[PDB]
């Protein structure tokens, strides 16, 4: 069952083993139960840690209900996949990914004062192809000022660094003007909407670009796995797959009392049930009660 | 889908588009009788004007029924399509059973015949291993968990290089 | 037996969700 804090995340999500648990919880509440006390505790590190480890339990089955658009004609199945992942991030408690990684940027370098360590401490979160170019243009403005560039904003060296890194950003191909005018806003709602109708266009191009990069990586990895697999004779393939399946089955059956092991074994029995149900009536598929 | 929809018996489709099934409706004042004719089947119903808005009160919410996962089914679909692409070029192999007669055996250099019979055994090996379709269910499970860990990011599942680059421009070019 | 249910069949089967639940159950009381 659930422990009164996992069930507060599973309300808006639509994955099956969360929806059936929420439905059994409401079956408990309608049939004469009181709601347990929500904890007014757990100081901020434990709060964001349990957010990190509780949104994981609602995102990780959400990826498996999302089918990859591997090798399809048109960029619109990539838009389907990225929209599904956006909806999964929305139902997982994450924000828009732009403002989410902006929040991570602010969280990472709250204690950085110069601009070289703001490019050092956010090395894991930005592209190294872009981090190398930003470090080299910062070494250029460092050769200009002959002083460490300060990460304050009102410094003239940082102003020249901003006017050079905007050219670096257009050199990467992404327009910094529509993005800065989006997050800086305008007076009237009409010239804010005219900026948003460019920023959302770039935003769609950006998320479909990295989603298409992801499905191209899975396409090439599946092609490499198949081409390393087709070079084997069939008895070696059957022995390797049966031995790997038996070993990872022994790894589950060894864990006695573990909940994940019991769920693993029940899903194995459900897979065998699916094989039996397609074996009984293969004209229509599995037997589903309706 | 939203809970309130706004469609039905207004800008509705008026007729058929295929030769497999026929349909024509009755656009009367208050009511509507459909007449759908499909070969050996015949159906003519009488529906009301508000009988189409009560249709979308309950939602269907169609869902997949997958053996392992919908993601695993998509990866197994791509492995089946790649096995189709390899099977299309094991289908253009030249027929070598026509050169098994003994009038090709004894006119041949012996090592060339050794090479030819070993090439035939190699083709039978390649064809037995490209049509092992039971093994795609365990080939797909080696692509799954690294992908599922990549989508289990600490910032956002749909995150990528370009959106992080754009937000780094937004973080850097503003006043700290 | 056969023809079990619909939401019992909609479950993404070999997703983790429980190993993460195991580590989140044995981590948070050990860190509070």
């Amino acid at each position: 069952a659930v422990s009164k804090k996992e069930v507060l995340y599973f309300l808006s999500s639509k994955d099956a083993e969360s929806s059936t648990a929420v439905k059994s919880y409401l079956k408990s509440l309608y049939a004469g139960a009181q709601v347990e006390a929500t904890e007014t505790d757990a100081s901020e590190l434990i709060a964001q840690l349990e957010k990190k480890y509780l949104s994981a339990q609602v995102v990780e089955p959400g990826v498996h209900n999302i089918a990859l658009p591997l090798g399809e004609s048109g960029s619109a199945p990539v838009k389907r996949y990225a929209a599904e992942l956006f909806n999964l991030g929305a139902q997982a408690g994450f924000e828009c990914p732009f403002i989410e990684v902006s929040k991570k940027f602010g969280q990472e370098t709250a204690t950085s004062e110069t601009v070289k360590d703001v490019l050092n401490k956010t090395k894991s979160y930005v592209s190294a192809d872009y981090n190398a170019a930003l470090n080299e243009v910062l070494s250029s403005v460092e050769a200009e000022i002959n002083g460490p560039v300060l990460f304050d904003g009102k410094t003239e060296g940082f102003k020249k660094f901003a006017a050079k890194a905007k050219a670096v950003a257009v050199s990467r191909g992404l327009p910094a003007d529509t993005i800065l005018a989006y997050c800086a806003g305008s007076a009237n709602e009409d010239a804010a909407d005219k900026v948003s109708k460019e920023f959302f266009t770039w935003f769609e191009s950006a998320y479909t670009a990295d989603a298409a990069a992801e499905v191209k990586a899975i396409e090439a990895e599946a092609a490499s796995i198949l081409d390393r697999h087709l070079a084997k004779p069939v008895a070696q393939i059957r022995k390797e797959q049966a031995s790997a399946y038996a070993s990872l089955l022994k790894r589950a059956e060894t864990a006695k009392g573990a909940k994940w092991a019991e769920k693993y074994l029940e899903d194995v029995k459900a897979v065998q049930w699916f094989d039996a149900s397609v074996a009984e009536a293969p004209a229509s598929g599995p037997k589903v009660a309706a | 889908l939203t809970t309130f929809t706004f469609s039905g018996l207004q800008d509705a489709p008026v007729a058929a588009l295929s030769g497999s099934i026929k349909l024509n409706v009755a656009a009367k004042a208050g009511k509507a009788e459909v007449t759908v004719a499909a070969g050996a089947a015949k159906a003519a119903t009488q529906v009301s004007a508000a009988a189409l808005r009560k249709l979308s009160g309950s939602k269907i919410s169609l869902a997949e029924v997958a053996r392992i996962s919908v993601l695993h089914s998509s990866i197994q679909n791509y492995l089946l399509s790649l096995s189709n692409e390899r099977y299309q070029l094991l289908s253009q192999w030249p027929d070598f059973t026509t050169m098994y007669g003994k009038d090709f055996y004894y006119r041949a250099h012996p090592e060339d015949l050794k090479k030819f019979y070993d090439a035939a055994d190699e083709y039978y090996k390649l064809y037995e291993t490209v049509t092992e379709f039971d093994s795609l269910s365990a080939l797909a499970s080696q692509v799954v968990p690294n992908y599922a860990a990549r989508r289990r990011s600490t910032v956002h599942p749909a995150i990528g290089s370009t959106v992080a680059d754009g937000a780094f421009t937004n973080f850097l070019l503003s006043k700290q | 037996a056969d023809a079990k249910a619909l939401d019992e069949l909609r479950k993404p089967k070999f997703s983790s969700k429980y190993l993460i639940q195991h580590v989140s159950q044995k981590l948070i009381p050990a860190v509070k």
Partner: peptide, 30 residues
Amino acid sequence: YLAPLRSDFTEEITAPKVASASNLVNEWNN
């Protein structure tokens, strides 16, 4: 068909490492 279960996070946002194209089509045409 069953995969090993992992519970770990990726904090890095990198390119997804598009792997090498293997030479099976050219070997089979050869």
